[PDB]
């Protein structure tokens, strides 16, 4: 049954701002005193309101289906891939009555896929959760490429420490400038490999505005960046203000002793998610 | 200064400085790559297009649309980032003598000295906001090229209604609100870095 919940959690992402964004967006307009970025603030809240009144997607580009599954106790792995077919058809089905864009091409040949499914497309993100028993979390993530097209990598030295990741953020945040579509939610991966940080920094973007960090410490570090990232004055659009970002998000591994590895993921002001818990059948 | 109008004379477009907000109650052309193409080559040529572009509102946008009771209903028209028609804007604005380009993120800096000799004026949509714009659609008057382009390539032809708010953002007095802030952006980040 899950093909419709898929769809249904789609049409969530795709519609519905989540609650935490849309206040973040209030506190951006009543704080700021750019006219130009204070005029942008409220055509967006005036867009949302309509999205959902009118069911049309508050964003044009739906993008690329990614979606964070967690598996409960006492699950047959037989029952886990016919329910990873089931997500797949779900995004065909969703692309169709949301309705979704289609967007995922093959990299060399550009030929669209027409269903967004092809080539390991639905970006299935896989945990294990001892505390659900026959119970799965879906996390619907849809990505837009403006924000993506702004993802960095570098591999500093240990001893740059805390000062080069402040600067390696400050610099990235500052070249992407208006084309991320500010203000912005910046996720920083900290530590494990390339890949594992790039993909601390896409999870890091799953957290809710406020959310810190809950060791204190990195808690902190997300405060000085969001206060020094809002002293950039990029504002909205990149048109000049004072709200540049509405939050900042890190996340955290084991690294090798001799690196440092740091992955950058910026999210538009269109942050985009639906989660669905569902138990299944005893 | 926050503008109004139904139609952009010439006349109109040179008073529009940087950072002017403008709203648009007439009609608007959208065209995206393809588009912008197609009309090269048949202005070029002689062709006669079915639709006239001298001192119009051209957006850059690919309009989702549903076909309604024999009629066609707009659900999503958000702006296309404008610098995919770096490289024929040029050509596109001496062959047609449109107003005013609409769109997000901006045009390369070269464009501005074109937007000077010819009366052009360059406004950014709340670039995300499909679902204002769309409601801003009050009909949809005709479309161009469906067979050949297909849905989003194609040129609609629109009539709108406080289709805004748009930021004047480059202007025929050769200013560009992107350099500006980028300009501001490089000197705060050195004091931090």
Request: proline share 4%; with cysteine; net charge negative.
């Given at each position: 049954?899950?093909?419709?919940?898929?769809?249904?959690?789609?049409?969530?992402?795709?519609?519905?701002?989540?609650?935490?964004v849309?206040?973040?967006?209030?506190?951006?307009?009543?704080?700021?005193?750019?006219?130009?970025?204070?005029?942008?603030?409220?055509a967006?809240i005036?867009?949302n309101?309509?999205?959902?009144?009118?069911?049309?997607?508050?964003?044009?580009?739906?993008?690329?289906?990614?979606?964070?599954l967690?598996?409960?106790?006492?699950?047959?792995?037989?029952?886990?891939?016919?329910?990873?077919?089931?997500?797949?058809?779900?995004?065909?089905?969703?692309?169709?009555?949301?309705?979704?864009?289609?967007?995922?091409?093959?990299?060399?040949?550009?030929?669209?896929?027409?269903?967004?499914?092809?080539?390991?497309?639905?970006?299935?993100?896989?945990?294990?959760?001892?505390?659900?028993?026959?119970?799965?979390?879906?996390?619907?993530?849809?990505?837009?490429?403006?924000?993506?097209?702004?993802?960095?990598?570098?591999?500093?030295?240990?001893?740059?420490?805390?000062?080069?990741?402040?600067?390696?953020?400050?610099?990235?945040?500052?070249?992407?400038?208006?084309?991320?579509?500010?203000?912005?939610?910046?996720?920083?991966?900290?530590?494990?490999?390339?890949?594992?940080?790039?993909?601390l920094a896409?999870?890091?973007?799953?957290?809710?505005?406020?959310?810190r960090?809950?060791?204190?410490?990195?808690?902190?570090?997300?405060?000085?960046?969001?206060?020094?990232?809002?002293?950039?004055?990029?504002?909205?659009?990149?048109?000049?203000?004072?709200?540049?970002?509405?939050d900042?998000?890190?996340?955290?591994a084991?690294?090798?002793?001799?690196?440092?590895?740091?992955?950058?993921?910026?999210?538009?002001?269109?942050?985009?998610?639906?989660?669905?818990?569902?138990?299944?059948?005893? | 200064?926050?503008?109004?109008?139904?139609?952009?004379?010439?006349?109109?477009?040179?008073?529009?400085?940087?950072?002017?907000?403008?709203?648009?109650?007439?009609?608007?052309?959208?065209?995206?790559d393809?588009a912008?193409?197609?009309?090269?080559?048949?202005?070029?040529?002689?062709?006669?297009?079915?639709?006239?572009?001298?001192?119009?509102?051209?957006?850059?946008?690919?309009?989702?649309?549903?076909?309604?009771?024999?009629?066609?209903?707009?659900?999503?028209?958000?702006?296309?980032?404008?610098?995919?028609?770096?490289?024929?804007?040029?050509?596109?604005?001496?062959?047609?003598?449109?107003?005013?380009?609409?769109?997000?993120?901006?045009?390369?800096?070269?464009?501005?000295?074109?937007?000077?000799?010819?009366?052009?004026?360059?406004?950014?949509?709340?670039?995300?906001?499909?679902?204002?714009?769309?409601?801003?659609?009050?009909?949809?008057?005709?479309?161009?090229?469906?067979?050949?382009?297909?849905?989003?390539?194609?040129?609609?032809?629109?009539?709108?209604?406080?289709?805004?708010?748009?930021?004047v953002?480059?202007?025929?007095?050769?200013?560009?609100?992107?350099?500006?802030?980028?300009?501001?952006?490089?000197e705060?980040?050195?004091?931090?870095?």
């Amino acid at each position: 049954k899950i093909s419709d919940v898929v769809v249904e959690l789609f049409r969530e992402a795709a519609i519905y701002l989540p609650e935490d964004v849309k206040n973040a967006l209030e506190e951006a307009y009543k704080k700021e005193s750019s006219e130009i970025s204070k005029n942008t603030l409220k055509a967006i809240i005036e867009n949302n309101k309509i999205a959902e009144e009118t069911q049309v997607p508050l964003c044009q580009d739906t993008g690329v289906p990614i979606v964070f599954l967690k598996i409960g106790k006492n699950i047959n792995s037989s029952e886990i891939m016919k329910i990873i077919e089931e997500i797949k058809e779900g995004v065909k089905k969703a692309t169709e009555e949301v309705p979704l864009r289609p967007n995922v091409v093959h990299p060399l040949t550009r030929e669209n896929f027409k269903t967004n499914v092809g080539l390991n497309s639905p970006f299935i993100n896989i945990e294990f959760d001892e505390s659900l028993d026959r119970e799965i979390e879906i996390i619907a993530f849809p990505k837009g490429a403006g924000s993506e097209n702004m993802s960095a990598l570098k591999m500093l030295k240990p001893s740059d420490g805390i000062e080069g990741i402040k600067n390696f953020v400050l610099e990235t945040i500052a070249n992407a400038g208006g084309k991320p579509c500010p203000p912005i939610v910046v996720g920083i991966g900290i530590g494990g490999t390339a890949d594992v940080a790039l993909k601390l920094a896409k999870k890091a973007l799953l957290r809710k505005i406020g959310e810190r960090h809950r060791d204190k410490e990195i808690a902190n570090l997300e405060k000085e960046l969001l206060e020094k990232i809002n002293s950039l004055g990029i504002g909205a659009m990149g048109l000049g203000g004072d709200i540049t970002a509405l939050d900042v998000f890190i996340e955290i591994a084991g690294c090798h002793t001799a690196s440092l590895p740091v992955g950058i993921c910026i999210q538009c002001w269109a942050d985009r998610r639906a989660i669905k818990r569902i138990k299944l059948d005893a | 200064m926050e503008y109004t109008f139904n139609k952009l004379t010439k006349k109109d477009v040179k008073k529009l400085k940087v950072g002017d907000i403008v709203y648009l109650n007439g009609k608007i052309y959208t065209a995206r790559d393809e588009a912008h193409l197609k009309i090269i080559e048949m202005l070029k040529s002689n062709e006669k297009l079915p639709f006239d572009l001298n001192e119009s509102i051209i957006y850059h946008a690919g309009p989702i649309m549903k076909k309604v009771n024999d009629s066609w209903v707009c659900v999503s028209i958000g702006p296309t980032t404008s610098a995919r028609m770096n490289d024929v804007e040029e050509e596109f604005i001496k062959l047609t003598n449109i107003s005013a380009i609409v769109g997000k993120g901006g045009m390369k800096k070269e464009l501005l000295k074109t937007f000077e000799d010819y009366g052009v004026v360059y406004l950014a949509a709340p670039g995300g906001c499909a679902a204002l714009l769309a409601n801003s659609v009050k009909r949809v008057d005709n479309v161009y090229f469906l067979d050949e382009l297909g849905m989003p390539e194609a040129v609609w032809e629109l009539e709108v209604n406080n289709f805004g708010p748009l930021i004047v953002a480059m202007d025929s007095h050769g200013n560009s609100i992107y350099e500006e802030v980028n300009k501001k952006v490089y000197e705060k980040l050195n004091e931090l870095i």
